[PDB]
Amino acid sequence: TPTLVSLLEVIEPEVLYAGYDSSVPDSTWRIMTTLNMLGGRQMIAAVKWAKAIPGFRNLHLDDQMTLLQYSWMSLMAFALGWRSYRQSSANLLCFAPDLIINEQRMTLPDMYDQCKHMLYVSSELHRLQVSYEEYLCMKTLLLLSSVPKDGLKSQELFDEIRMTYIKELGKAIVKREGNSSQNWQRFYQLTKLLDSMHEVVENLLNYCFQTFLDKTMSIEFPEMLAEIITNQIPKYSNGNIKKLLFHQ
């Protein structure tokens, strides 16, 4: 029988290129615009990815839509944090192979203030020496990290699936030879990182919601992102979000 983590591994999305011409000079506006277009393409691939996660298609269609709309930024920032920790350490954001935000790009007006929250993610994965298997389990768990205030249509089934991937994370932790005390603290550390994704995302969504709503900024979002932001803005203003936590 194929392991649950090996099924999460085969469905890992392909590498996307930004289509960024490096011969033309940089600007904050140019980088932000290119990142929005890349994000939209990443979110179309995330839908294909989510549908192949064992259990996800069994949830009501409305729940599938809900989970993807709440977690979009969490999934993207986490995947970016992972690429950035594997490809080139330490203070580099590896959005695409043709779009790495280096120290020279970080000096661009207000580039650092939006990048620092994402740099924290790669920094944490590096400090905790997160494995590929732990990462895969953690990423699926981020898709299941927020639910509506009054829960899902398939709430009981969701709770079963979420418990399954928590247990799957536990099995990946155990694979690193250590005693019960250090396994307990690893699970504690990793789930604390999962919890902190809510705060990392909060900062990214503020820039997101502002740039989307202020049309005088001429910051374009592709259809996929524009549709998610339009859906999400009222949900944040009406308190319609239950951020699931492992601690506190």
Binding site: I44, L68, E227
Partner: peptide, 13 residues
């Protein structure tokens, strides 16, 4: 409402 996401989930693949 949310036409593109619904399409991507409902379509084959």
């Amino acid at each position: 409402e949310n036409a593109l996401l619904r399409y991507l989930l409902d379509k084959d693949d």
